[PDB]
Amino acid sequence: PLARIKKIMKADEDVRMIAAEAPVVFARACEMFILELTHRGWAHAEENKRRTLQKSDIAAAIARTEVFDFLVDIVPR
């Protein structure tokens, strides 16, 4: 979804032009980001012996990951 990754990249302040390679490297970076967030969420879900990945699990993944300290605005801890 190259167009939106550019649209959101320039929607939020960006410095003018975007090289064509930046959204391509971003979608892959977004792909690896969903992985780690989904890996970390389901690890919390499976540790609680639940087979359903719910909204609560992503809050736990953001909470104790210092890598995702910037995401606590979305999840009420």
Binding site: P1, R4, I5, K7, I8, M9, A11, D12, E13, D14, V15, R16, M17, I18, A19, E21, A22, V24, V25, F26, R28, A29, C30, E31, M32, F33, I34, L35, E36, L37, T38, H39, G41, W42, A45, E46, R51, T52, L53, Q54, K55, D57, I58, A59, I62, E66, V67, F68, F70, L71, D73, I74, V75
Partner: protein
């Protein structure tokens, strides 16, 4: 103008999890906005580096500088081989 990414997030999550694992309605969406926040949090850090050099364009070398400074060391390894191949 904080637009959301596509429903293609659903399918990336499904391939990330084992076969015996299924996903909720709003856990789909929580990631959709956590990855929308991820694009803005990276673009802003790299934009500052671009301005340090009065550069009016943002490239893949800046986004990967941004994720290195912001603390995604697990990402910059594979992403370098992916970006250099895109130019190969």
């Amino acid at each position: 103008d904080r637009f959301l990414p596509i429903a293609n997030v659903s399918r990336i999550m499904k391939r990330s999890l084992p076969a015996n694992a299924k996903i909720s309605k709003e856990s789909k969406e929580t990631v959709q906005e956590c990855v929308s926040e991820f694009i803005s949090f990276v673009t802003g850090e790299a934009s500052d580096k671009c301005q340090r050099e009065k550069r009016k364009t943002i490239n893949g070398d800046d986004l990967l500088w941004a994720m290195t400074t912001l603390g995604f060391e697990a990402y910059v390894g594979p992403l370098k081989s992916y970006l250099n191949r895109y130019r190969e």
